[PDB]
């Protein structure tokens, strides 16, 4: 019984330019020249430190997430607005404000994803399982499994409300309506809930986002109705375009992700599949008659799959939508996720399983997943000597190597470190090590690792 | 003979889904999906191969160019419709084209840039002033010059209309409106225009750029009111986000820039520099209260001197589009540039000169853009020896490093080099050549570069 | 030598596909919609045999818990199995038939797969290594190198042997005996014996002699041992 009204808030947390400019439309601005978006360009998706260029980064796979959910926002706004946005105030300009809404959600997720893809994360919570016991007196508390089962997206909603700090708490003071919509997952990590898997916010954030749904009519478990369209977005974006890299690289052939699909036993039967394939075989006859080496072959090919993929997945994510808006719009939603109730959902599961099989176990992306792991853990290793003991009170962080290494972390982040509030002091010092490694490119992990490991060869015996 | 908004925004396409899509907006898709776009991100858009990843590269230079016009349409589609556009058929949508059909363009306009920035670019011009002599007689012909001065944009359009190419000779197969606005010097090298310095397109576009002008009522020498749009987006995304960039690679101060500002000429007595330092001046004493080290002060300082003239040169520059509508529309507008003729000229060009002295002109910008520059004429050098002779008729080619070479070149380019058109032969030589060199990152063509002076050890003895 | 050069044709057909899909290059999948899209193949009874038997055989051996690699390894590993027993019964099958014109001595058979049953489907597998196996990037960059490599050792070997039968003595710098010294001596016995054969034919056929017999990682050591000791005399 949610109401479109203070779903679409656009007041901002911050206490109260803009010519011609909704506040929606503002927040795209200020996601979009923040530092971490540039940041994301060297930030990888699936395959890490990759020489090729036309394989997708963070920055590019963000850029197409966000241009999927623009779209799906203009085919809401200017059509379909009926069936969807009933009962909503005329001060609402639905055209201007909901594709720009979609957009800049879509952009800022995956902001605060760590480097090295999802398998850096991983490392850092195994870092964080060791260096932060769970026996242990001063980190058994469950607070602490922020750190222990580390992931992006609390990262992500720490990065646009605490961390881009200029002289507020407030950090970038994105509206209501963008925060709210920005948890992909709402609950915390004490929180438990068999409806999410993973906690979206840290503790840090609590009270914020009590604050946001004091603001949109949502609650714990609850998402806001455009989180499923930019999760459904991100998914297909990054299984298809997962696998036009994966071709292009040449672990596979569009011959092989066609018999992947045909040969599912989900996909065998499954009408958006088969009219992709359908599709793709008659363009793909067309395309042999070329001279062509079969390279080339492949990626002409797979653009072609692209573009029907795209069109018949987002079609079928939209008509899921307006079909289940009265779902998505009641206070106890139980859907999962916006692609399972679509008819894309098979081509979808299909499309992750071939990029798992051919992509993320491959050998190259195995070992470069491995020195991505060491250098992780090296550079939080000699990052903890002086950082551990800053907040409590203990001195072992006084060494020279420890007050440059401290020297060498965010001053933004050290300010919000540095700050006065409720947070015990190991969980500041831990958040402040988290916030250092999720906020690093891999190409500046290396440098960083490298440069500290020549300067702690003294301090190392 | 003023020029109708009609065939300004023909939506048409040059080759003789779709779900709920326009076609203007189904362009920004095909641009932002294509690859070139991407691999924009490792091409250098003021400093050259730079470690710190929050430096602009020529991708996010291009999207926050792309935000910028689309903010721009939605103003001018939203707010100011009734006095820009007039006499408009109702079947095309302009809430939804202007916005992305300037969003597209903008995104577009540094697509075919070469490796190493503008002076890349300058490095391939004196490469083909020293291997195409003039005095020569296979070269003595004007078209020719269209590689002894080589610029982007015409590489650009050859890119969105032909270098892309599957199984057509329509490349992307933009629309016209967005083919006519992309143009940005509607002239070619042969003509000889006072009102424009630069050649927009090489002759190998000269019958398409015609198609175009036929189909959306333009003509030799004046140009798409959409593309003043962009050109003033670009001038202000990169005056303000290179100053931006010199401020965080510590090359200059805050003060440096509101001091050279005030102590300008132009603007000492300018009311938009007046209230944009005014308004900084008076956020940095609130910031300066802080506890903060220098280069944070300067950070955040310069990151709300970026958004105060952005706001100011924005709106100056769409109330000048606004004011001069009819004289853009006009068969025969002189109209050099937005940006001159808004109240917002002395600002952008008091920063482009900042830039200039401070940006560029810099010891390490000046040592990397000479060993760019080598790199560049090496590739291109190494490169003609597989290239040269191969539609002429000379067999020089025939060495193994020869058809290693030409093997290395990309497939695309090399079919759309094998076609069969009424080019001359050293024309098309040199095109190959111009387009395999143009569409390299910077990091691929130093590998290039250093593979192929590792395998070229023999045949140079 | 029919036989053998059709054995030689099958044993390489089929082994360097088994080897380009072992390097990762293709698929098993790509080289069955090769076969089955290819234009004298598409109506092939051999083909259409392989191609069943294969595809019976993966079909049962995707039901297990496998790796894309290993299922690609062994299905083809079936596929050489399939295909080398067929095409070798079909030549078989082919001289049987054609044996009185081989024994002809008139003989004009270019060979023997091309007049067997198994001509399409070995066309077709020569193709797929010629498009897959060769033209391949690493291929292609190792071949450029090999390439480099052999001119450089043959110019080197070519100054302590040329002059050597025709009288010039610009063989006698002391690079050029040591270089003339590091040759087979098999091949400078044969060089040195008295026949009707032209000097330069003679210098010519020493070259070719040593360097055909070199091994890969033979020629790549002589090659950077003799150019470290031709930094002098190069100058
Ligand atoms: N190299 C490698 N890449 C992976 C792996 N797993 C996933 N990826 C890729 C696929 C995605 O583009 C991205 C993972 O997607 P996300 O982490 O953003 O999913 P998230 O849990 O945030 O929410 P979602 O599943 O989309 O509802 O990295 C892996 O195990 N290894
Ligand atoms: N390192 C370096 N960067 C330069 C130089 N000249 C310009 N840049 C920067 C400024 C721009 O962001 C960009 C050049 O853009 P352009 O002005 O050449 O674009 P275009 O001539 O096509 O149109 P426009 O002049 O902007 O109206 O690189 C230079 O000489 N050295
Ligand atoms: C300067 C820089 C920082 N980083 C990482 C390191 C930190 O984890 C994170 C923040 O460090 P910062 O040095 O504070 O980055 P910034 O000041 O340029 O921008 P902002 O503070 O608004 O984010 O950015 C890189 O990955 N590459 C770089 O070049
Ligand atoms: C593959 C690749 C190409 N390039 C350059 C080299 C060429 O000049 C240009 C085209 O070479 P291609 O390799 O043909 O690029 P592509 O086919 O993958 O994508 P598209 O043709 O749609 O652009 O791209 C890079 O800079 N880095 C790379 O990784
Ligand atoms: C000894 C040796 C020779 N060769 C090449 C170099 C010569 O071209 C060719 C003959 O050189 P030889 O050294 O004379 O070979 P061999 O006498 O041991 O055996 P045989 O004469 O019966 O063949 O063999 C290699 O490739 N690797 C080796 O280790
Ligand atoms: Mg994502
Ligand atoms: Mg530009
Ligand atoms: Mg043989």
Excluded at 31 to 38: C, Y
Excluded at 142 to 157: P, V
Excluded at 204 to 213: F, L, N, T
Excluded at 340 to 357: E, M, P, R, T, V
Aim: net charge negative; charged share 25%.
């Amino acid at each position: 019984s949610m109401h479109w009204n203070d779903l679409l808030n656009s007041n901002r947390r911050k206490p109260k330019t803009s010519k011609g400019r909704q506040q929606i439309e503002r927040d795209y601005d200020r996601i979009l020249f923040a530092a971490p978006t540039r940041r994301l360009a060297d930030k990888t998706q699936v395959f890490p430190l990759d020489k090729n260029d036309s394989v997708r980064t963070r920055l590019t796979h963000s850029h197409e997430v966000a241009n999927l959910s623009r779209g799906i926002g203009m085919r809401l706004a200017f059509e379909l607005e009926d069936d969807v946005f009933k009962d909503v105030s005329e001060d609402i300009c639905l055209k201007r404000d909901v594709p720009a809404l979609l957009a800049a959600i879509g952009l800022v997720h995956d902001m605060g994803n760590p480097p090295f893809g999802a398998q850096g994360a991983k490392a850092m919570s195994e870092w964080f399982t060791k260096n932060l016991p769970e026996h242990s007196d001063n980190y058994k508390d469950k607070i602490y499994g922020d750190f222990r089962h580390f992931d992006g997206n609390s990262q992500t909603l720490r990065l646009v409300t605490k961390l881009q700090i200029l002289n507020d708490t407030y950090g970038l003071n994105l509206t209501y309506a963008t925060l709210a919509s920005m948890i992909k997952y709402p609950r915390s990590s004490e929180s438990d809930s068999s409806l999410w898997k993973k906690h979206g916010f840290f503790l840090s954030e609590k009270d914020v986002v009590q604050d946001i749904w004091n603001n949109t009519g949502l609650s714990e478990g609850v998402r806001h109705p455009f989180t499923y369209i930019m999760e459904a977005c991100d998914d297909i974006a990054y299984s298809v375009l997962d696998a036009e890299d994966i071709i292009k690289k040449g672990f596979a052939s569009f011959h092989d992700l066609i018999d992947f699909i045909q040969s599912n036993q989900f996909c065998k039967e499954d009408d958006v599949a088969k009219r992709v394939i359908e599709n793709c075989k008659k363009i793909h006859a067309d395309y042999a008659q070329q001279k062509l080496s079969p390279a080339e072959l492949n990626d002409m090919s797979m653009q072609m799959f692209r573009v029907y993929a795209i069109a018949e997945l987002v079609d079928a994510v939209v008509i899921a939508f307006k079909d289940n808006i009265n779902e998505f719009l009641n206070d106890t939603c139980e859907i999962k996720d916006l692609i399972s109730c679509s008819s894309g959902k098979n081509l979808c599961q299909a499309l992750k399983k071939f990029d798992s099989s051919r992509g993320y176990q491959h050998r190259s992306v195995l070992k470069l997943e491995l020195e991505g792991s060491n250098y992780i853990k090296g550079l939080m290793d000699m990052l903890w000597l002086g950082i551990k003991g800053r907040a409590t009170g203990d001195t072992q962080y006084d060494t020279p190597f420890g007050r440059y290494v401290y020297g060498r972390i965010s001053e933004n982040y050290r300010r919000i470190f540095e700050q006065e509030n409720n947070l015990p002091a190991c969980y500041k010092e831990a958040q402040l090590l988290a916030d250092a490694i999720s906020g690093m490119t891999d190409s500046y992990l290396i440098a960083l690792h490298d440069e500290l490991r020549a300067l702690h060869q003294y301090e190392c015996r």
